[PDB]
């Protein structure tokens, strides 16, 4: 198959062989596969799904990152990553609770955009625990 | 004789151009509708709303042409 690496400055999040993956992006997520074109790619808040050889899956939430794809060995240089069992649905509710606080907190438009991104992050965490149940 | 015969051709041209105009027109918006939905699936019911708004605007003149086509063909003949 092909191998994917996933890291952040705080930690290596995943690395290994993958039959396939699905990954967040800018204009939404994309599927990625061995045969996919070598698309260097920006990332907005969301998840990646890690389906390893013989079809076994992991489900990672990402704050953000960049998905370089020159090779078949691809990498996500994530800004911050937590897995769907390293977080839990209560921790995703705490992320949502922080987002609800941030929505309340200030009037400034870039602050409001940060709060909106924190909401998108929190819902992406909830969605990754749903993917983890799936 | 031509007063009978030509009216059918005039209606034919009216409903032919109406069919090309209406069919070609919304296809681009329908395209941005499906690609945009594929890109931002969260926004689908919203974009769908906006889609309806621009689609009801694309229909005015071709419906003028086709309604008068049926007038020419059946009322005056």
């Amino acid at each position: 198959t092909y191998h994917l690496d996933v890291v952040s400055a705080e930690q290596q999040m995943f690395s290994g062989l993958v039959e396939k993956i699905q990954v967040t992006g800018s204009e939404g997520e994309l599927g990625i596969y061995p045969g996919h074109a070598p698309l260097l790619t920006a990332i907005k808040p969301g998840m990646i799904r890690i389906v390893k050889q013989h079809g076994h899956e992991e489900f990672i939430y990402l704050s953000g990152g960049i998905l370089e794809v020159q090779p078949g060995n691809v990498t996500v240089l994530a800004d911050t990553a937590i897995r769907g069992q390293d977080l839990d649905e209560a921790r995703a509710m705490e992320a949502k609770r922080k987002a609800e606080e941030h929505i309340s907190s200030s009037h400034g438009d870039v602050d409001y955009a940060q709060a909106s991104a924190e909401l998108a992050k929190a819902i992406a965490q909830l969605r990754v625990i749903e993917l983890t149940k799936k | 004789n031509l007063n009978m015969d030509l009216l059918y051709m005039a209606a034919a041209v009216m409903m032919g151009l109406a069919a090309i105009g209406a069919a070609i027109g919304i296809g681009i918006l329908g395209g941005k509708f499906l690609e945009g939905a594929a890109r931002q699936p969260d926004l689908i019911p919203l974009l769908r709303t906006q889609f309806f708004i621009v689609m009801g605007l694309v229909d005015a003149i071709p419906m003028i042409a086709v309604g008068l086509g049926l007038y020419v063909m059946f009322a005056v003949a």
Binding site: - | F52, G56, I61, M63, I64, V66, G67, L70
Partner: protein, 266 residues
Amino acid sequence: ENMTPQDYIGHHLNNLQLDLRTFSLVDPQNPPATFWTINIDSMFFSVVLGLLFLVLFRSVAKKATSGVPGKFQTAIELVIGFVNGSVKDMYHGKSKLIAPLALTIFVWVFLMNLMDLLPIDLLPYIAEHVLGLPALRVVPSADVNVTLSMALGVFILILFYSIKMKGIGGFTKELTLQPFNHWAFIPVNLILEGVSLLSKPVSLGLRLFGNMYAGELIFILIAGLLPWWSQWILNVPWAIFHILIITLQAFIFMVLTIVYLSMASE
């Protein structure tokens, strides 16, 4: 009955009228020219469908409860929420008229279009053989006069709101100075904005009509030209298709009426 395909299609586009200057019913082939000659059948079904609408809605509205609603009460509160949502998204003024206007347009146009799905001879057959009327055809929105009557209604509302909310000084400004700004272009600007303003509602009425006239005509064609053993297989797909048309045309006439009054006033 000895009607040819074309002849029966004819009698299916033939209309019955009542002469207001003589109270005579109108012959299958000899119309009076005088415009005072009401298209009675379409009026009858139009007003009776509007009466049914208002009776059905009043019977709930006089009793409706804010607990969990009954099965019928829910189907009315749904369309109320659906209409309110569409208005609120497009209109931001104070006027109490716009939301019920949207409602009455939606439900009445919907019920008038719904007549097109029935078997094309059922009511005309009964109206000739049981009642003996010299003609009938039942789809009200399939005649120009009702759809332009509704459009002229909306045009009078458009004028009223463009006069009320911004006055003659603003309306005259917008009609003369745009689009070319300079006073030098006023005679040309009057042409460009005037034909647009007057065509918008007239187009809305005929926009619905250009669908329901062809709709009925298509059913007439399929029932007239084809033999019965092949009528069904080509009629049924059109009926299924025309369901989406009736629903969209009702939604369109509502939405566009809100769009016009919003763009006119604010």
